[PDB]
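Escalated from tier 1: delta-amino valeric acid holo job.
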Amino acid sequence: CPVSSYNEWDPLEEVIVGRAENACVPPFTIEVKANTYEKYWPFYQKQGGHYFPKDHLKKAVAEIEEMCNILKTEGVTVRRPDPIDWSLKYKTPDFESTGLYSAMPRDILIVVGNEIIEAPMAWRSRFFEYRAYRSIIKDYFHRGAKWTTAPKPTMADELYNQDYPIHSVEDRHKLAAQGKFVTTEFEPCFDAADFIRAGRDIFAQRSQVTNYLGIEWMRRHLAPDYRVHIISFKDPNPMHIDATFNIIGPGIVLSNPDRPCHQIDLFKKAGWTIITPPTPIIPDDHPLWMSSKWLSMNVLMLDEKRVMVDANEVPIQKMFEKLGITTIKVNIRNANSLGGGFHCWTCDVRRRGTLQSYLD
Amino acid sequence: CPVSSYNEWDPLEEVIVGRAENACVPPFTIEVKANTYEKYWPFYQKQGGHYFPKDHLKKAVAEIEEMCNILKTEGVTVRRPDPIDWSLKYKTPDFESTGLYSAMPRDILIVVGNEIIEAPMAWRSRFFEYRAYRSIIKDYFHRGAKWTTAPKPTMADELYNQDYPIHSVEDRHKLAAQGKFVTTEFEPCFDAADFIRAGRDIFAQRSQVTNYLGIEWMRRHLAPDYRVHIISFKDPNPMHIDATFNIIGPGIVLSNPDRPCHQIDLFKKAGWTIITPPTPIIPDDHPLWMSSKWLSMNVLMLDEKRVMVDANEVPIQKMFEKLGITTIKVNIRNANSLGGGFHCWTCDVRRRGTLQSYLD
Ligand SMILES: [NH3+]CCCCC(=O)O
Ligand SMILES: [NH3+]CCCCC(=O)O
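Tier 2 regenerated the structure:
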């Protein structure tokens, strides 16, 4: 089987790397507002439906091409999604919208064993995102892999709290703490990036884009071989878990110092080593349209002792080095602006290894 | 100025479209043999000096007339070369020969800014090809355009390796790789179709008909405003670059999957999107006297989002459509036999736009 990955660290053999091409600024709708920083709301308000700045995109393309070159150098087979113009307006019986991009494979695809799963998504501008990945997936299917598409939401108004009282990131954090998110429990929805793998145990967080119905779907679909656990954090990122709690080896995890896990003791009890990375050094003037500055810890492990890390983030490079982990430095400063780091920009399709339990 | 074109994609306003009339099969000399497939060598050997099959030419005329109709429909002003009998034998102090045709304006004329340049050519049967275009060029000159004629070669025996060891297309590919071509460096020579424009940067390839002296001439003549770069490919077409590396927009290029560019990383580093088109579907029984089957990617851009493409080549039509580029389908299956696709059969005289750099 070409597809086979049970965790985030076994020796990487094949990966899908995203594309920056024709990326479109999403229309400024409620769910977009609930997942971005106030600083950019007016950018979305004005640029909505237009391409992201083309000079910026060009730099991102260059950065990602180099990353792919380095992966091939590290012995990894790289697959890329198909080029597509994301500006096309589409219309379902429930809504109308333009697209986003196919920059982040981690947001939509998750590999559990020999099974590739397409996440439903929760943003209207990402409804047809799966189209960029179908050529690769059909190939794996022909070659023997299992293929699953979680139930695609209608994304009708009922899935969103149109009056979600968010006016600042501080409000959202408060609401989030009260169990209030922009997405209701009308129908299942989720981004695959809210799930992180550790063999037989998979950890998920209810976020602005992933609801309890969505997590339950994953839970019910993967049982009994896999167990899906729900964990929560203080002042969580509106979406995605990989820059909050990135598992980098058997029993080792990177815990974002600003977003402590409410269930950290479950991990301490299992004898897991919780590492808190140093703060990011990325300039506050650099645009991060989506995401926080914590992309620095959004690393991708080529294996247990080899990590692809940002060339600019020296302080976290040193941390890995004192731990005896070889750092493969790559610069994706401009690609970062699109919303992701190495883990987000990829989807590990095949890692050499077996299914195990690390929670014991 | 009626003449003004800095690249291959700005909004087209005026174009010169070739003619199939009185096309003559070139005498089978060494340079003709080095630029054609073994399958047709005996055709040239027998038909040399006679007109190409007249029933075939008639079909080509019909196809090109329709193309012109569609261009006028798309708002483009079309100029056509003068009708001429190419069978006339001429004689310079260096050689004697019959002509070819004025089917491919791209082979002989290149527009750089407000300047129209007549290529010297490298085939003895194309020595007097410029005669079909003089009425149009003098008109543009009277109207203000700059007019240049690169040094016309003597085309004496010294320009050719009379004993060029080509017996199959596989031999040529090997020789080409060794830096051995049918044309020596005796005097400058080139076809304008070996040059492709991207604003301040122009790319050229040393081919069977374009030597280093010829490229240097262009380089020296256009400096300092324009930079002429030499790029090479694996298993290149004996002549012309436009069905190997066709630039279709700012930072976007079509790279023939069978002829990868040795310098592709220069482009990846600039943040250019390299698209590899699907394979041609043209029947192997259809005669392609000159050219390979890759005419499918020899498209002409009416603007960045409008491309004139072959009606029969559905797979490449789909590629453009997923990229959000409107396809203007036209059938030139029979015209193709003469050696070209849309880019070859035309010469963009005026595109609306300015001189820019896209390599940064
Ligand atoms: N998938 C990438 C988004 C990560 C955003 C953050 O945690 O700041
Ligand atoms: N000027 C048209 C010749 C193109 C031939 C080829 O590249 O197969």
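Residues 54-73 of chain B form the longest helix (20 residues).
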